[PDB]
A paper describes a structure:
The physiological ligands of Eph receptors are membrane-tethered proteins called ephrins (acronym for Eph family receptor interacting proteins).
We report here a 2.7-Å resolution X-ray structure of the HHV-8 gH/gL ectodomain bound to the LBD of [name] together with results of structure-guided mutagenesis and cell-based studies. The full list of contact residues is given in S2 Table and is represented in S6 Fig. The gL N-terminal segment is restrained by C26 and C27 that form disulfide bonds with C74 and C54, respectively. Below the gL “tail,” the single gH residue that makes contacts with [name]—E52gH—forms a salt bridge with R103EphA2, clamping the bottom of the tunnel (the “base”). The GHephrin-A1 loop, which is the principal interaction region with the [name] receptor, occupies the same space as the gL “tail,” while the salt bridge established between the conserved R103EphA2 and E119ephrin-A1 is replaced at the same location by a salt bridge between R103EphA2 and E52gH.
Numbering used by the authors:
A (entry chain E): 27 to 110, 112 to 147, 163 to 200
B (entry chain L): 19 to 128
C (entry chain H): 35 to 126, 132 to 211, 217 to 520, 527 to 546, 551 to 557, 560 to 626, 630 to 696
The structure:
Amino acid sequence: KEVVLLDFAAAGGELGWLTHPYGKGWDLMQNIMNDMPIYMYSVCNVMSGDQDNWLRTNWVYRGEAERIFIELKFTVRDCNSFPGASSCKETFNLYYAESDLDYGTNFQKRLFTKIDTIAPLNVEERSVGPLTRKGFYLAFQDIGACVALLSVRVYYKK
Amino acid sequence: RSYVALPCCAIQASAASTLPLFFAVHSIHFADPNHCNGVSIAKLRSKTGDITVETCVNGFNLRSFLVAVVRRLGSWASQENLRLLWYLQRSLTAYTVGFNATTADSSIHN
Amino acid sequence: RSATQLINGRTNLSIELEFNGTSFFLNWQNLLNVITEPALTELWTSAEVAEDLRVTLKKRQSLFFPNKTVVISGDGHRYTCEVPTSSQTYNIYSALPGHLGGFGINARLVLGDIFASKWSLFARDTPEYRVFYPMNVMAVKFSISIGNNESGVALYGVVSEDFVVVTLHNRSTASHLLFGLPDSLPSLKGHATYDELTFARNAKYALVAILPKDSYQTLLTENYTRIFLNMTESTPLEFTRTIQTRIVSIEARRACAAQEAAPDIFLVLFQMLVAHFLVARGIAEHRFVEVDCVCRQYAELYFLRRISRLCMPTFTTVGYNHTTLGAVAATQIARVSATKLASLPRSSQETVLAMVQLGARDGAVPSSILEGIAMVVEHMYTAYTYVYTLGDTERKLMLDIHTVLTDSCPPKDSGVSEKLLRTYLMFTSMCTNIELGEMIARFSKPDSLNIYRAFSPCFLGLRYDLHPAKLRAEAPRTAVARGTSGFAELLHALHLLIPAINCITADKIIATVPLPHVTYIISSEALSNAVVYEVSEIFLKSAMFISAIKPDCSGFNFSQIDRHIPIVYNPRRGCPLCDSVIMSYDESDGLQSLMYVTNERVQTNLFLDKSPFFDNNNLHIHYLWLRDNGTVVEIRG
Ligand SMILES: *[C@@H]1O[C@H](CO)[C@@H](O[C@@H]2O[C@H](CO)[C@@H](O)[C@H](O)[C@H]2NC(C)=O)[C@H](O)[C@H]1NC(C)=O
Ligand SMILES: *[C@@H]1O[C@H](CO)[C@@H](O[C@@H]2O[C@H](CO)[C@@H](O)[C@H](O)[C@H]2NC(C)=O)[C@H](O)[C@H]1NC(C)=O
Ligand SMILES: *[C@@H]1O[C@H](CO)[C@@H](O)[C@H](O)[C@H]1NC(C)=O
Ligand SMILES: *[C@@H]1O[C@H](CO)[C@@H](O)[C@H](O)[C@H]1NC(C)=O
Ligand SMILES: [Cl-]
Ligand SMILES: [Cl-]
Ligand SMILES: [Cl-]
Ligand SMILES: [Cl-]
Ligand code: NA
Ligand code: NA
Ligand code: NA
Ligand code: NA
Ligand code: NA
Ligand code: NA
Ligand code: NA
Ligand code: NA
Ligand code: NA
Ligand code: NA
């Protein structure tokens, strides 16, 4: 079983995702673990207050997928590990949005449905279904947290 | 490049040959002796394209490098340069009083 | 690719504390302006910031950390070369303030002569790179290499204006010794800081020892507090002289090329560098310096360097030049004439000799200085004949004379070279049986031996029999084994034929006696163009031949039909012994003493109880009279 439509950790850094605040907020970052390059999307604007930092995945062609599972592997830095502005959070938000075509760099928060709040290496899994349009995007919203998202894999069973 | 999501890191054997040039480093991030299991590590943040590169480096060696750099400023060393120098000296001795085999082991932060 | 390209409009290198929240900043442009881009690159590469922490731990555990820094509350010794308001000062050439160097000069130029060339230190391929960051300093470099590249050791050090660093490398890991200003010592690397490696400390100077735990045990057990006290609380002059004594001690043990005692040679090198450093620091810490005082210091330093090179021939020094001070000394010594030099007090003529050392130009001592040396030695020898002893002050004067005479081009004029032959002959006349015994006794106790007591007229003599077997035969506890050897060692290195008489000999010469009108060669065999005398009543293997040659290589008027030495029997009523030589020899041990009879008082003092001649209690000694016309007789009765 488990047919994988998207796997960020297996992309080897050749998969770039959209960031609505470009520069601030989410950033694509490389580290080296066990002498191999491990990539992640990380954000940590904790001492700044209002944030609303969005990270949108590439377009994922649906295919035969009707009920998909989203598996997030991520780390959250403890808010008490900062000398502060006590407006930081320890969760983020997972959204998705279906479309028959690839919109590209066009990003509209209006079209994205909130899947769930992701809170505590943290391994979370959510389910979405049924999907009807030709493809879908995932989205991650930061509201003032210190998160390093290392793996995102979407798949369907059998 | 103000706050890092993974403040603790493991020093990799491949880093010695793929170190970024000094003029390519955007920022240096030092840890605490009260963090990262006492392990004296640090993070260089450089950048290639969209990718901010984070390199895990030796805390003692980087602190001594910065000490050497500040000491060669001489008369031109400003107030903030000397405050940096004193942080470096104090944190060097602090990491030195607790330098152990447990403390040289940074692989735990993998 | 370029550093400016990599910076890319980034004003600051930011340094964040991840858990404190404060940030430091280094201006990129200011870093580049103050510290050049090559220097930044080299520091960054040498830092090895990606080195694994276990390697750093192993590096740190490999060191020896002292108990606790010992702080001496003093400031060292006071500067002895300070200019009193009783003398003049000059900034900087015909302006000649007399002689003897009793004035002062601005030290800005003489300081620039010491540190005139820069050197890059702690380079990538070097072992000191393991602990120091590479740096460029104005300095003077010293380097000794003892043994082959597979088994030997390499000692090398650097004296800069602010510190001294010396390194011992066991393959020709390394040991390091530093001395200087605590805030100016070269930047260390991660695994060690300077406070924990500081053994002794002054209010101005500090001593640091970065020694591996497996290094030479003597370096680890060495008491660096005593070393620091002997380095700082004595004037640099007497300290330099103690280092000269230690070099002499190394010479007397045949340890100049021994792999063993390499840490001892390392300590001696460290101390010599510290002496140079302290003299230079005295030069820098004062706006004006006293000429004669600094010339004395420089002369002691140069003698230390030269005697160290004599011991270890691989000893190399690059940097310590004295061109301007040498020109000052050249102006000072050009006034001194022979009678002037000979009438000066012993200390003042020692100062003159020091300035002659420094102001030698192209290795040419002025003829006036040589004639004055002849007169000084003449007075010294005439006075010696009264007590047949020599004080340490007179031996120090002889050491200065020997330092001046060596490395001096031979005299061009005939008369001055003849007078030099005369003073050489007088030095031989002071190297008698008593002197050989005394020197053996002195060298038998190397602890109480110092640089003055270790010097003897034999070093400037025309005796060539002074070999370990002969000296063994000339000695009077069981330390005679050492005393005879070490002396011989120091005789082989500090001794000195190039004058006159070319009319065909070998190296089988026992002694050379140059009288005004005839020259005697005491040799193992006869000579062609000579009047030969076969020495009688001597052992077969000690056999001697006294060959008399005239300087113009002409023959004599008398013609012996036999090479026997006639015998005469039975003080003086005039001076029959003037311009002659009285020579004693032992029936089994050959030549014992020989004395040139310069005047009437030498003649009459030859018959004193402490004289090395006419001892009736000796049943196997023979006395020969070598006259100026070529005749040789034997004195008996
Ligand atoms: C190393 O040498 C120093 C030379 O001063 C010794 O220090 C002195 O030792 C004497 C006794 O031997 C004391 O009375 C002094 O008070 C000491 N002076 C200082 C400044 O410490 C020192 O003891 C020697 N170390 C060893 C291990 O022998
Ligand atoms: C060389 O000089 C010596 C003196 O130094 C001469 O010795 C004299 O010899 C004659 C007869 O041989 C004696 O009558 C004198 O009394 C000797 N003088 C002294 C002072 O003892 C010797 O004759 C000279 N030889 C030659 C060849 O001229
Ligand atoms: C080193 O120090 C740490 C304290 O941070 C301690 O827990 C550890 O047991 C020590 N290791 C050794 C080998 O002494
Ligand atoms: C750089 O640091 C200086 C102080 O060292 C500060 O005045 C300046 O604002 C900083 N600039 C930036 C861009 O961080
Ligand atoms: Cl990418
Ligand atoms: Cl990855
Ligand atoms: Cl955390
Ligand atoms: Cl501060
Ligand atoms: Na991106
Ligand atoms: Na796109
Ligand atoms: Na960090
Ligand atoms: Na570099
Ligand atoms: Na501490
Ligand atoms: Na560079
Ligand atoms: Na050196
Ligand atoms: Na005169
Ligand atoms: Na005397
Ligand atoms: Na000899």
